Amino acid sequence: QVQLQESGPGLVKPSETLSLTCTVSGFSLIGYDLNWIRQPPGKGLEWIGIIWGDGTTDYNSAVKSRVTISKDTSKNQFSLKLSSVTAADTAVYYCARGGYWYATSYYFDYWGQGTLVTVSSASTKGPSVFPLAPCSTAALGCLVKDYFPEPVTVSWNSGALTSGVHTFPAVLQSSGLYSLSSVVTVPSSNFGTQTYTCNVDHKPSNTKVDKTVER
Amino acid sequence: HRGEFSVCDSVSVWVGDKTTATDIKGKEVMVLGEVNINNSVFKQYFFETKCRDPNVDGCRGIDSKHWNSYCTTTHTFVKALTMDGKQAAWRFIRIDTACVCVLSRK
Amino acid sequence: DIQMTQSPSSLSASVGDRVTITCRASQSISNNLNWYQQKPGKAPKLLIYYTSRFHSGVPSRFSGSGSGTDFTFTISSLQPEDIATYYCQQEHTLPYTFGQGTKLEIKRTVAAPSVFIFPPSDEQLKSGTASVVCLLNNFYPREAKVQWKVDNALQSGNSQESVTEQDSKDSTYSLSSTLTLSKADYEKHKVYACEVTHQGLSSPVTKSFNRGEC
DSSP states (O other), X not given: OOEEEEEOOSEEXXXXXXXXXXXXXXXXXXXXXXXXXXEOTTSOOEEEEEEOTTSOEEEOTTTGGGEEEEEETTTTEEEEEEOSOOGGGOEEEEEEEEEEETTTEEEEEEXXXXXXXXXXXXXXXXXXXXXXXXXXXEEEEEEEEEEBSSXXXXXXXXXXXXXXXXXXXXXXXXXXXXXXXXXXXEOTTOOSSOOEEEEEEEGGGTEEEEEEEOO | OOOOOOSSOEEEEEEOOOXXXXXXXXXXXXXXXXXXXXXXXXXXOEEEEEEOTXXXXXXXXXXXXXXXXXXXXXXXXXXXXXXXXXXXXXXXXXXXXXXXXXXXXX | OOOEEEEOSEEEEETTOOEEEEEEESSOOTTOEEEEEEOTTSOOEEEEETTTEEOTTOOTTEEEEEETTEEEEEESXXXXXXXXXXXXXXXXXXXXXXXXOEXXXXXXXXXXXXXXXXXXXXXXXXXXXXXXXXXXXXXXXXXXXXXXXXXXXXXXSSEEEEEXXXXXXXXXXXXXXEEEEEHHHHTTOOEEXXXXXXXXXXXXXXXXXXXXXX
């Protein structure tokens, strides 16, 4: 029943203002606190601020002068605004609701899945998708090349195929563009009528690609 | 410190939409949306803890062979700006504060 | 600001093992310490609050202990699904601070990779670039060597590789290596080989194709 989902642009230009909303369900925004926590790529967690049930806020001193946390109870939403943005702000931003066990204990019980925000002067570039097929236990895949910024999500057969799937971390090329591969392993004689489609989504450029890979 | 579980499951929230409460005199009273000091007005909020639906897992870890038991919501008195009649009143109201296990002999 | 220092930063242990993670606060936080588990690609999940209290859906194998400045997180019988980064979190004062995290991996038996090679597609060739892909599937340990050969010439500085996070069921890893060439250079050679060295392979295994037969 409790759901949190953050949204915002994956790309913000340096010195501009970062803008994230957290859309919720299952609880009242009046009776619960909302926290914003961030995680730079390959790094630890950092609490940025809080909006208590009453509407009062408190922000971490490290970011304080640039932070704005608000809430729209009518839209079941919480906002986060981070002004005068720098590369130190590139991170996965999480919205987490606080929970209490009396006034004795406080904890972040429900989290969103996080949205990656990249700070760069560089432009958004949608990917090119290429098939990964053998020349001749069989493997196939998709190569999601030349995209910026991260991320790219890859699903197979509209999420109906999950067993044998490996979507690899993106690799940063010399061109400053990202590239990834998603692969799926299948038994040698599981074809005949079997279609394999990789569903590539790159929200920053608003690109959706459905690539059908043939034997 | 050592406690892994509660004998009674509870729920703690901020209450910002309170309109009625029974005062210390046991009489139903209207609770105001706003209070003030010499300068600023504040919206009336309360922190409340109560039992989760069953009243639990009978409390958890109770010696059933010897005791009957149940989780029950207990209260506290909190000051709140209310309306007694025509006049506004800063009075003690009864609000949900805990969920405790109560025993009964078999 | 209270600083949380976790130890060790990383740990490998076998299935069935007892694992102990430590958290140390700069000032006393009494019992106001929470533990989170973050699975690869997932948001952190609350396990323990108020030093030792269990949250909903947490295994009986997990536990928390401590007071003031010293805290502990224990896994009594480590399972393959416990692969994650664990974080302790102070809630004694604002700002809330987390420890740097403890990456937990699993020591497993040797599993040799299953190797696959993929030539560049005709549609990518149209663009002027050739990407040859090598897949190393479900192996253990993580260490593995991929040598690209083009008409028996060992390639270097023209490939990039990626490794997946440890699988939560079989505790193996998978790797993909992309060899990047231009259409011109690709069209001037015949044999594209991917040679794999791994502890599970008695001798290196080679997977190859001949350009113009795909």
